[PDB]
Amino acid sequence: IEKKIVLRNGTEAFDSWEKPPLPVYTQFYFFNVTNPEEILRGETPRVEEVGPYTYRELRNKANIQFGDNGTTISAVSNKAYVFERDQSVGDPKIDLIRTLNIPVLTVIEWSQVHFLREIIEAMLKAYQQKLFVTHTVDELLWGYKDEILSLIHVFRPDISPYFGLFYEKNGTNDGDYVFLTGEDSYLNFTKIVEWNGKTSLDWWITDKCNMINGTDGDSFHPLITKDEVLYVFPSDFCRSVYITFSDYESVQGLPAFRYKVPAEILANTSDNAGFCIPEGNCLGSGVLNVSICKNGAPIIMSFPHFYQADERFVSAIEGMHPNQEDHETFVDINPLTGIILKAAKRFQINIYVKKLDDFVETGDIRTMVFPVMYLNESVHIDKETASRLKSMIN
Ligand SMILES: *[C@@H]1O[C@H](CO)[C@@H](O[C@@H]2O[C@H](CO)[C@@H](O[C@@H]3O[C@H](CO[C@H]4O[C@H](CO)[C@@H](O)[C@H](O)[C@@H]4O)[C@@H](O)[C@H](O[C@H]4O[C@H](CO)[C@@H](O)[C@H](O)[C@@H]4O)[C@@H]3O)[C@H](O)[C@H]2NC(C)=O)[C@H](O)[C@H]1NC(C)=O
Ligand SMILES: *[C@@H]1O[C@H](CO)[C@@H](O[C@@H]2O[C@H](CO)[C@@H](O[C@@H]3O[C@H](CO)[C@@H](O)[C@H](O[C@H]4O[C@H](CO)[C@@H](O)[C@H](O)[C@@H]4O)[C@@H]3O)[C@H](O)[C@H]2NC(C)=O)[C@H](O)[C@H]1NC(C)=O
Ligand SMILES: *[C@@H]1O[C@H](CO)[C@@H](O[C@@H]2O[C@H](CO)[C@@H](O[C@@H]3O[C@H](CO[C@H]4O[C@H](CO)[C@@H](O)[C@H](O)[C@@H]4O)[C@@H](O)[C@H](O)[C@@H]3O)[C@H](O)[C@H]2NC(C)=O)[C@H](O)[C@H]1NC(C)=O
Ligand SMILES: *[C@@H]1O[C@H](CO)[C@@H](O[C@@H]2O[C@H](CO)[C@@H](O[C@@H]3O[C@H](CO)[C@@H](O)[C@H](O)[C@@H]3O)[C@H](O)[C@H]2NC(C)=O)[C@H](O)[C@H]1NC(C)=O
Ligand SMILES: *[C@@H]1O[C@H](CO)[C@@H](O[C@@H]2O[C@H](CO)[C@@H](O)[C@H](O)[C@H]2NC(C)=O)[C@H](O)[C@H]1NC(C)=O
Ligand SMILES: *[C@@H]1O[C@H](CO)[C@@H](O[C@@H]2O[C@H](CO)[C@@H](O)[C@H](O)[C@H]2NC(C)=O)[C@H](O)[C@H]1NC(C)=O
Ligand SMILES: *[C@@H]1O[C@H](CO)[C@@H](O)[C@H](O)[C@H]1NC(C)=O
């Protein structure tokens, strides 16, 4: 019998939940575009992998308020990134990556449908823009100021002049959570009962696809069994996800279940039909159109190098060489305590791009899902926390 693991002040679990002792690392990998003018004339894109750029994460919960007798708890997870130079391939402020111009592809999408109405497109033809641009890794991640966005900001202050993939994500949270702690049942430990004051999502077609299942992914309920499926809600992924048992593992001195993300998640099927907007029509297996959660931006999520995806996605881009061991998402969980020992959470950011006759910027470019960057969010238990854990077992 152990629930030493519940969120209650003074307990083992709560302190660890509030200020995680295990350091998490996020490393970024970029795809440098080697043939922009040839792509614009309709040839196959050739890219180059650049990285890692390693950032150590700072984690803790704020806004903590207990609720409902000690069954529920409200919190926000703040997260910050500290760059590690010696563990990275180079200095992200010096290093240049050439890739798609995301701000202008974004406002274009905004023009055809109207998030921004059509009419200020006349900016684009006033100031002509290149589809492929060159910025530093630091500019691409943490933001830079854009010509066209700046011009719009004048008329629409609600719209930011700045764009970055992770822009204004440093030292902030993903929004308001209320977590279900474990004292009604150990099973429902650190389970998510709401996000921004709503119990389900807006975005997806089906009821079911809009469901929020599982934990935030940083931990799991104790006494996990091999047979059972484990649910996660990665907010940034804009949908719930489950992982399934793969193998038995050992991390440090501790036994572990190896849970991985199955191919069922991104496959074009059945249950996943609700993720294809607007009608049940999917780009294919292995991709997720997140435009809805990404502010109307033509962003397509996928796994690194289109791992677990239709091959035509891989074939479309020269330089995509997917493999299981490098690009898979796995989590090694201590079965008894539901604690994560080792994990690699990996996913890719891509951009949908197609030829447009109203926009000369698009040229003759092929219709494809264009890779920009992927990442590995990892954690590894040290031996002093491990051995202390393995004596605490008894
Ligand atoms: C991803 O792919 C992109 C595009 O292919 C690469 O971006 C290029 O990066 C290289 C450097 O790695 C750049 O080449 C350098 O440009 C510098 C800037 O040139 C301007 O300024 C100088 C004055 O300082 C002017 O004379 C010049 O006309 C330009 O106006 C130069 O300063 C560099 O010169 C030095 O380079 C080598 C030594 O490094 C020597 O041979 C030279 O004599 C001199 O010492 C150099 O020419 C290039 O401009 C970038 N291209 C673009 C489009 O931005 C990324 O590097 C690549 N990413 C990775 C990780 O590889
Ligand atoms: C986070 O994710 C990234 C991306 O997956 C990951 O970086 C990768 O690490 C792996 C493991 O170290 C690297 O794979 C190696 O590649 C070199 C290239 O020559 C090989 O020599 C290595 O081969 C050894 O191990 C293999 C295991 O099967 C054997 O097949 C082989 O014969 C050797 O024994 C190994 O394959 C990979 O190159 C990097 N990728 C990048 C882009 O850096 C990172 O490790 C993950 N975790 C952490 C904590 O960073
Ligand atoms: C990825 O997902 C995106 C969003 O989930 C997809 O974009 C959606 O699908 C198409 C884009 O081609 C749009 O459908 C058109 O919408 C426009 C705009 O409608 C609005 O404006 C009219 C008139 O101003 C107004 O009456 C309406 O109420 C709307 O407010 C119409 O002109 C078209 O006829 C057609 O309806 C969707 O609107 C668009 N949605 C969003 C939220 O952007 C995108 O296509 C997906 N990508 C892939 C590759 O599948
Ligand atoms: C989050 O909610 C549930 C997690 O369990 C996911 O939906 C579940 O999907 C399975 C199969 O796809 C359903 O199995 C069904 O069993 C019931 C009877 O028990 C029956 O009505 C069906 O015919 C089928 O046999 C399961 O019931 C269903 N869960 C619920 C509550 O209906 C859902 O996909 C998850 N969403 C995400 C985004 O992960
Ligand atoms: C994200 O924010 C954190 C803090 O909120 C930054 O970490 C600090 O950076 C300053 C300036 O580089 C240093 O003086 C501090 O020592 C850092 N704090 C710690 C705990 O080391 C971090 O640099 C920011 N990262 C990015 C990419 O902006
Ligand atoms: C995703 O799956 C659906 C079916 O679940 C595909 O639609 C089918 O397309 C094939 C073409 O090979 C036809 O034979 C079927 O009759 C179609 N069925 C339906 C219900 O449309 C759809 O094309 C798939 N998406 C992609 C990108 O391959
Ligand atoms: C968690 O506790 C039990 C175990 O599954 C379940 O019946 C209950 O509905 C859950 N509580 C909430 C608030 O969802």
Residue numbers in the entry: 37 to 430
Q: What do the paper's sentences say?
A:
Here we present the structural and functional studies of SCARB2, a functional receptor of the important human enterovirus 71 (EV71). SCARB2 is responsible for attachment as well as uncoating of EV71. SCARB2 is ubiquitously expressed and serves as a common receptor for all clinically isolated EV71 strains, CVA16, CVA7 and CVA14. SCARB2 (residues 37–430) consists of three domains arranged in a “Kidney” shape.
To gain an understanding of the molecular basis of SCARB2-mediated uncoating of EV71 under acidic conditions, we solved the crystal structures of the ectodomain of SCARB2 under both neutral (pH 7.5) (hereafter denoted as nSCARB2) and acidic conditions (pH 4.8) (hereafter denoted as aSCARB2). A striking difference in the position of the “cap” is observed between structures at acidic and neutral pH. In contrast, at pH 7.5, the re-positioning of α5 in vicinity of α4 and α7 blocks the membrane-distal end of the tunnel, decreasing its void volume from 4,867 Å3 to 4,554 Å3 [calculated by program HOLLOW]. Thus in nSCARB2, α5 (residues 157–164) adopts a short helical conformation. Helices α4, α5 and α7 are held together in a compact cluster by hydrophobic interactions involving residues W146, L152, I156, Y163 of α4–α5 and I184, L187, I188, F191, I195 from α7. Under neutral conditions, a cap closes the entrance of the lipid-transfer tunnel of SCARB2. Amongst these multiple sites, based on the contour of the electron density and prior knowledge that lysosomal enzymes are often modified with Man9GlcNA2-P, the glycan at N325 of nSCARB2 was modeled as Man8GlcNA2. N325 is located at the bottom of a cleft formed between helices α11 and α12. Man8GlcNA2 protrudes to the surface out of this chasm and stations itself in vicinity of the cap. Notably, the sugar moieties adjacent to α4 and α5 are stabilized by P314, E145 and H150.
